[PDB]
Scaffold this active site. Sequence first.
Site, PDB file in Angstrom:
ATOM      1  CG  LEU I  41      36.809  40.672  37.262  1.00  0.00           C
ATOM      2  CD1 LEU I  41      35.420  40.898  37.797  1.00  0.00           C
ATOM      3  CD2 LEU I  41      36.709  40.141  35.871  1.00  0.00           C
ATOM      4  CG  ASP I  42      40.999  43.092  41.500  1.00  0.00           C
ATOM      5  OD1 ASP I  42      41.790  43.109  40.535  1.00  0.00           O
ATOM      6  OD2 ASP I  42      40.670  44.112  42.136  1.00  0.00           O
TER       7      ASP I  42
END
Lengths: 56, 68, 459, 52, 60, 157, 171, 176, 87
Positions: I41-42
């Site tokens: 995830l970013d």
Amino acid sequence: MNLFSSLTLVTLILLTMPIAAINFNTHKFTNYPLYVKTTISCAFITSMIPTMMFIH
Amino acid sequence: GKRLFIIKPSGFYDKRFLKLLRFYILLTGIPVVIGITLINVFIGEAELAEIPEGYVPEHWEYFKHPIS
Amino acid sequence: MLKYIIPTMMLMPLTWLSKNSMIWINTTLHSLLISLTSLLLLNQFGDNSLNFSLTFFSDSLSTPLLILTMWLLPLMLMASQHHLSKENLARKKLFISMLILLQLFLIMTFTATELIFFYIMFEATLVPTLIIITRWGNQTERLNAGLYFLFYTLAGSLPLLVALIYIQNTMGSLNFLILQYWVQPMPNSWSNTFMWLACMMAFMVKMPLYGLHLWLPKAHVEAPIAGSMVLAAILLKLGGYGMMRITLLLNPITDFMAYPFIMLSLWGMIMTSSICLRQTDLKSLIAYSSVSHMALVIVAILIQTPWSYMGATALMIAHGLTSSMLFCLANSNYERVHSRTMILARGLQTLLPLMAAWWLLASLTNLALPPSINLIGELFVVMSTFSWSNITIILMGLNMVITALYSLYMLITTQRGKHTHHINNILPSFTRENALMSLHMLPLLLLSLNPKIILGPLY
Amino acid sequence: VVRDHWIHVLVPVGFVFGYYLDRKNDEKLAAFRNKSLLYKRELKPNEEVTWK
Amino acid sequence: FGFSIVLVLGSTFVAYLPDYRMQEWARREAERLVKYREAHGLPLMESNCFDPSKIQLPED
Amino acid sequence: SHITKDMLPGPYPKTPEERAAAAKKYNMRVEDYEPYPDDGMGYGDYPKLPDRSQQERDPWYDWDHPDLRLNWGEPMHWDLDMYIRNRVDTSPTPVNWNLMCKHLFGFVAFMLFMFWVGETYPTYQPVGPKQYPYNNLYLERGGDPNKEPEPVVHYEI
Amino acid sequence: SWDKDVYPEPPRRTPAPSPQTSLPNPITYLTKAFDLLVDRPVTLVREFIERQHAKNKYYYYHREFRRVPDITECHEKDVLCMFEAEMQWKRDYKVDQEIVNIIQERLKACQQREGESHRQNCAKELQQFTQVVKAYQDRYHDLGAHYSARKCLAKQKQRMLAERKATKEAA
Amino acid sequence: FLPSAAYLTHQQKVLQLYKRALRHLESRCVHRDKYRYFACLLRARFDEHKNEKDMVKATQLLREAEKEFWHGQHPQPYIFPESPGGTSYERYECYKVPEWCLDDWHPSEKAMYPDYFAKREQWKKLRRESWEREVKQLQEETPVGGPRTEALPPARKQGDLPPLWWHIVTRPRERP
Amino acid sequence: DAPPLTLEGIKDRVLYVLKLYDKIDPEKLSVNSHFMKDLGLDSLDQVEIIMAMEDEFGFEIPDIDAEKLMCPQEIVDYIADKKDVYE
């Protein structure tokens, strides 16, 4: 008349006492708020009266 | 373990000073005030009278209060 | 008062011929004995002053100052240990006997019936304090400070001698009473101008005035604590006392030449309350505060009003007590941190928890808290000067505002907000220091109850 | 006990000595014993003095 | 000897002491003189407190 | 007890060696060590800083001193005595400076101008005087209980 | 008591209530409570104190004086004459201060008893107050701080000389 | 101006602008639903040119975005009642008494609290006993002539405590 | 003014309010789970995570600790540092 005078003077002088009390206590009122509450209650009940005499 | 140890700075030196202060004022606070209470409950001031004739007054007994 | 003078001499040699570890108790005990002994003097009755043959007299202008000095002696001495405690027995006995001889000259000065005697005992006040601050000046330019002190006090005070001999051989002897009686007006010539300029200039330097107020701060930042208190309280209020004496003569020329001194005192009083707002160096702020209070005193003395004289001697006594106290608390903080700078000693609400209460009480006496004698003095000064010029209340009120401002600023700066978490060397407050706190402020409030003693001769 | 410590005996004796010197100064300045105009009365009636 | 025999004894000695500046003496004396100048009809506190018959003015 | 050579006599010159020794004496950036210049105002050879210093230095950098925003070896800015938090908070302003001062003084002038409009144009209600009995209430003004009556009466409508 | 000669007081004029209610009367209940509670033992303590000082008595008097003649009956030097003159003068000054004090106390009394009838029955007492204070302004005011006695008399000659010449030219 | 390095980064400055703009939007945009809407709007406006491989394009549009952020900031934002500037900010500094104290208590009070003070005694001996060898050795060896960081490594060598533990661990409870 | 707080309770609460978030799966949620390394995830939405957990616990963790946590266990470490929760 002496009543109105003494009642206003005690509505002043019934406030001086707790400060001199803790300066002359050396022990702990843990219920020191209860003490302050009952002396302010006494001051209010002796101050509701002479106003009523005043406007009377 | 609800209660924890909170850190007071120090108490005993401060309380010792205040204790000694009130006690060693009170050592002649009670006797002096009760003594002057005995003064104005026993001897009283004076009467308001005037200088009589044929009389050389002292420079005291111009004064009301007996301690003064 | 010779029954008060001969124990001031004979209080000395006991300090010499006492055994070790016993000089302290003897000096304190006998000092408090003489404190009550000359407190018994107070029977100034009504019309006249009270006299004793050719040497001694007492107005109300001198008796509270006298009682104040003999009150100061145990306070003076009892502050003055723990920085010379480990030093030598002979040098310590020398120090204490030097303070006692200093106060003997002070009592000679406050009960000076004549004025030539007053000049001699004035520079007798000058000389021992030099020796004390120069032997124990505690810092690096005590040389410089003692030198400024000695040459300012002489070279101001010296032509006062020639002016008083001139008054001597123009009007007979220089009793205070005959000068009350054989006075005659001295008009607006130039000789009266120079004579008034000489006498008032010597006393301007003594107060100090603002024009030569660099005298004071070095003399306080480089003095020991007993010399600091005696210097500030007794020397500056003694200068005011001498002006109050000799302003009885020279009525009409002070109307002319009183203008620039009052001007300089007012504007420099404001500039002094400006200068003790932003400095560091915690000790010196009270020194500039004393400069501002004595400028207020000077306005009060030269405006020549009975309200002014009553409030002026009130301000003398109250500022003596408050300044001596606040110097003692400065000594306590320097005992703690060994710094004298301000931004190092921070916090101290938890640490030394009841020392804050005495700091607060001192800052409120310097506030002009209203039942305090300080506000009685400042208030009657404002009343008299508003009768005098009716627009000058601007600088009085602005002095009041900035004075309360810097006093409360020095309160909440040093001793409010955060311990700097590197100190490790504050100790819980000694019983000696708090004993000196109670030595200061209980007689101040008991004076505040019945202040009908301390007002001036124009009561 | 006094020869144990004769320390604290000096200045009270000095005070009483100075008080005696003030009374002797009163005796030495004993001019105008009733010779004012406002304080001028009869030496009467006990014994031969008006103030000491 | 610093706080007990000194402070509060001094406070009792100075909170009442004799009539400093003859004060209550002056109270009673001003009262009786106001009584005098009321019951004698003449106005109170006339000017020329020194005798205006005993004066000499050097004129032009 | 301290070295005399770590005090601060003289101004900046000479520019190699005195700047070098003062930069090593105060521990700053070497070429950005500023004299004031030699303004003759005292000021010695002490540095000049970007003058704000306190509502910058956000408290999440977590240096040593809690409230001085100080870290025990710093230039200890010459005007810090005016710069402390509780004294002057040099925060970045939310709008401008000129915008603030112009709008504030203009609004005060606008309100005082319309106050002068209020001072010159009162309001009232269609009302005459009261009717005091004794010649517009004699004997409860200044007095003269036996001297000065001025007869002027009230008439009904 | 006191001297009603020096301290006059107006006649008492106390009205009487009239209910015309059936509450019945709480404040009378409470004022009888106050009297029968506090007023008895305090009066008894007064009685005890009166007796226990009525065993033996003391006496204080009022210090009265002679009159030393004058200051203008003293010459240019006369230290043994000017001293008497100045002390008699300064005691006159102090008792005159208390004169002005008593008149101001009467003025406070007149403001307080009248309530809001300010401009009635206080013309007399404020008027005599203005009279005595005009005298005091003329006589003891413009002399400054170091008064001895001679500044007062120089003021006296100055005032009567100036007003003599002014009414001379304006006669 | 950070304890690890000197340069912050491009990414750190972008990310701090993100946190500030989103916090300002919380303060501007109450009722929380149109806030949630505008939060997706702001996240999309960062996603408009997230795709940029460039650097000068990124920092130039970052500078214009800083203009846009100061263009519409808020006067009194919802700063937390623990954060500096906020409502508390050492509110409860009434009893943050420092832990070097309590040495100077009268021995009656040290008779009142026996076992805790015996434990502080053995902690203090644990401090003094473990200061010379490991801590002085790791402060000889591991410091380079320029330390060049504001963070020390632990005592991962063999045994006991990492250095400088005392006035970091032994901090007050932040809670009277 | 002093609620009861445990490490287990605060760990389960942080894991709960993680698991309510959309684009992470409720499947692969671990107390030891690197937000940067092994979840993918970013970082931007990781700062959205930082923002929402700040808003829940009612104190800002700083920007300088908005960099270097990346896992729930060090998140529990830093919140236990700010709150001082041990017994």
